[PDB]
Ligand SMILES: [Cu+2]
């Protein structure tokens with residue numbers, strides 16, 4: 001999806017890449033953190049259903065963790081897209097904007 | 110994905126199949142409704158960003174729609190897997206639960 005689309009279509013120049021390296025790594029770490037909650041939650045679901053295959057309080061709670069984590073990933077990705085944009089050379093923002101707006105437009109049709 | 114796995118995944122008698130096809134339609138409609146809301150949000154993000162490439166009131170509201178949709182999808186998938194289970198004769202439930210448990214545990218790694 002959208003992070004990967006931008007990184008591929010619109011690659012950073014050598015200075016942008018050095019400059020954005022800490023932010024790219026912090027995003028990676030954030031993404032891994034959210035994904036680790038979503039997997040833990042899959043674990044809690046396997047565990048619960050092994051004990052009682054039913055829509056139990058454990059399964060309700062775990063589902064709510066999966067919900068949160070899914071939404072959090074989308075917010076964290078969107079804020080990162082803007083963060084990246086800000087570190088680009090002003091001359092590079094138009095292509096990046098096009099690629100972004102097109103990706104969102106695609107996602108609307 | 111989880112859906113795709115289960116699906117494969119246990120034999121169905123004619124009567125189970127009939128009902129599980131009804132349930133598949135119902136799940137299809139729900140997935141479409143959430144997709145619609147996600148698409149509508151994505152358009153709004155695209156519109157706002159083309160106008161002003163910053164985190165505006167419009168971006169915020171659309172991002173919250175996207176978050177809720179991403180979560181709704183994941184809840185819907187999990188509800189459906191129980192709904193499918195509810196279509197199976199009692200005797201055939203243990204085998205389904207084994208595949209589901211396995212799936213969720215692989216999903217936790
Ligand atoms: Cu990035």
Ligand SMILES: [Cu+2]
Nearest residue numbers: 112133136193
């Ligand atoms: Cu299904």
